Amino acid sequence: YIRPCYFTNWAQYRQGRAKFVPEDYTPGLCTHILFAFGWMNADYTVRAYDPADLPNDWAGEGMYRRVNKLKVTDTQLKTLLSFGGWSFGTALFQGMAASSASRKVFIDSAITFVRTWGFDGIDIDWEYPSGATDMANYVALVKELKAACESEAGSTGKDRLLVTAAVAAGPATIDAGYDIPNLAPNFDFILLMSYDFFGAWASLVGFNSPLYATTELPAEWNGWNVDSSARYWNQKGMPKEKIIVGMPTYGRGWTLNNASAINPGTSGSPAKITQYVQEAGVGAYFEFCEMLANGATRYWDSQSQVPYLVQGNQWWSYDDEESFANKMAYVKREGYGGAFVWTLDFDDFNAGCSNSNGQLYPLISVIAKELGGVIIPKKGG
């Protein structure tokens, strides 16, 4: 079972208990660490996102080496350099993928870059390719990228670089952007972004990552859930061993319009900002645990098999130990390739919740143990 985890190189800048560096990783937590993110130049060459990624005078070894140095104490761990994300937008992807020669510049620059900095593969999180032009250029990029990685491996004798992508879970996005049959043979696996189905961008109070649909939400959304999107990628021609189910350690929240209307499918505006994530409508597991300690009421959605909590006018959809174990039993029963996490930094990665029994990574640990057979230690002696 492939169990990748996203490392974000800006989580080191969060405050106090939220500060996350690679040294907070613990062996066997993941089989793959995706480094979010690598960056691009206007000419589509590759560069570091953060100067602190490279060995420097101020931070020292730098985040690339500090993440890759994790492979000495986790001897089966592989790393990948990810490109894109939502903040990256699409204008630079659209230009880079526009021609054989613009793609090759990125492809050659990227393969060189990852071999220089110790990564075992290249992850494309273009969010999102859209339309016939994009759809064909995206298929050309992944085929040409894999083609170059095979060559480089053939020439060098090294194990071939991995070629993955974080991909959309929404049916309309999936249709407008991805020629799956022409993509599947050139991908090692895809990180299915089976979350952000509902969110503060809209008034519809819903679930970030419902495993199944619920009749509490209007039928028009029956496809916006983990099970439907994974099936959709399988049905369009991605093999299951390549579909890695996405797992959020963050949650999405709302300021209710009516404090006594607390059911899924009510209406609201973005949630109040939380202390450490500092993004309205988003919040981390280590923040939700404190809400539960400070009086929030925990609810379980039986149809969608995920929790929500309510505290005053604050309504939060999130994931916990129960929803994680239910999604992992889901992954095994249905035979998908494994599960990945967005992100390591939103789990209670240091058993720092006031409520914590000491378990490091209470959420991600369930994936190590239920998919990997790995027991993550408790903090302390």
Ligand X SMILES: CCCOc1ccc([C@@H]2c3c(-c4ccccc4O)n[nH]c3C(=O)N2Cc2cccnc2)cc1OC
The distance of closest approach from Cβ of residue 95 to ligand X in the complex, given in angstroms and rounded to an integer, is 19
Q: Site for ligand X (CB under 6 A): which residue of 108, 179, 216, 279?
A: 279
Distance CA 254, CA 320 (A): 18
Q: Site for ligand X (CB under 6 A): which residue of 318, 342, 346, 349?
A: 342
The answer to whether the annotation marks 100 as part of a ligand binding site is no
In terms of CB distance, is 85 or 270 closer to ligand X? Answer: 85
Around Cβ 151, how many Cβ atoms within 10 Å? 12
Around Cβ 373, how many Cβ atoms within 10 Å? 9
The distance of closest approach from Cβ of residue 329 to ligand X in the complex, given in angstroms and rounded to an integer, is 23
The answer to whether the annotation marks 108 as part of a ligand binding site is no
Give me the phi and psi of 180, to 5 degrees please: -55, -50
The answer to whether the annotation marks 128 as part of a ligand binding site is yes
Question: Mind telling me the catalytic residues?
Answer: 127
The answer to whether the annotation marks 85 as part of a ligand binding site is yes
Kindly write out the interface string for residues 15-54 of this chain, putting x where it contacts ligand X by CB under 6 A and - elsewhere: ----------------------------------------
The answer to whether the annotation marks 238 as part of a ligand binding site is no
Under 8 Å between Cβ of 355 and 294: no
The answer to whether the annotation marks 193 as part of a ligand binding site is yes
Closest of 204, 239, 209, 242 to residue 227, by C-alpha: 209
The answer to whether the annotation marks 38 as part of a ligand binding site is no
The packing angle between helices 321-334 and 226-236, to 10°, is: 20
The distance of closest approach from Cβ of residue 86 to ligand X in the complex, given in angstroms and rounded to an integer, is 4
- Report how far Cα 316 is from the mean position of its chain's Cα atoms: 19
Q: Considering the rule CB under 6 A, would residue 196 count as an interface residue with ligand X?
A: yes
The distance of closest approach from Cβ of residue 157 to ligand X in the complex, given in angstroms and rounded to an integer, is 32
In terms of CB distance, is 117 or 276 closer to ligand X? Answer: 276
Distance CA 348, CA 366 (A): 13
Which residues between 74 and 103 bind ligand X (CB under 6 A)?
Answer: 85-87
**Can you name the residues that pair with 223 across neighbouring β-strands?**
none
In terms of CB distance, is 90 or 109 closer to ligand X? Answer: 90
In terms of CB distance, is 192 or 309 closer to ligand X? Answer: 192
The answer to whether the annotation marks 1 as part of a ligand binding site is no
Q: Considering the rule CB under 6 A, would residue 125 count as an interface residue with ligand X?
A: yes
Structural tokens at position 325? 């174990």
The distance of closest approach from Cβ of residue 183 to ligand X in the complex, given in angstroms and rounded to an integer, is 17
Tell me the residue number closest to ligand X, measured at CB: 85
Number of residues in contact with ligand X, rule: CB under 6 A?
9
Element spanning 172, H or E: helix 171-177
DSSP characters over 3-71: -EEEEETTGGGS-GGG---GGG--TTS-SEEEEEEEEE-TTS-EEESSGGGS--SSSSS-HHHHHHGGG
The answer to whether the annotation marks 86 as part of a ligand binding site is yes
Structural tokens at position 224? 């916006």
In terms of CB distance, is 89 or 358 closer to ligand X? Answer: 89
The distance of closest approach from Cβ of residue 263 to ligand X in the complex, given in angstroms and rounded to an integer, is 23
Under 8 Å between Cβ of 166 and 37: no
Kindly write out the interface string for residues 208-227 of this chain, putting x where it contacts ligand X by CB under 6 A and - elsewhere: --------------------
In terms of CB distance, is 24 or 196 closer to ligand X? Answer: 196
Instruction: Indicate if the alpha-carbon torsion angle 290, 9, 66, 1 is positive or negative.
Output: positive
Q: Site for ligand X (CB under 6 A): which residue of 81, 107, 162, 166?
A: 166
Under 8 Å between Cβ of 201 and 192: no
Distance CA 139, CA 181 (A): 10
In terms of CB distance, is 123 or 152 closer to ligand X? Answer: 123
Structural tokens at position 275? 């202390």
Instruction: Indicate if the alpha-carbon torsion angle 176, 180, 182, 187 is positive or negative.
Output: positive
The distance of closest approach from Cβ of residue 46 to ligand X in the complex, given in angstroms and rounded to an integer, is 17
Q: Considering the rule CB under 6 A, would residue 347 count as an interface residue with ligand X?
A: no
Under 8 Å between Cβ of 191 and 30: no
- Which residues would be at the binding site for ligand X (CB under 6 A)? 85-87, 125, 166, 193, 196, 279, 342
- Binding site membership for chitin: which residues? 57-58, 84-87, 128, 193-196, 342
Binding site listing: 57-58, 84-87, 128, 193-196, 342
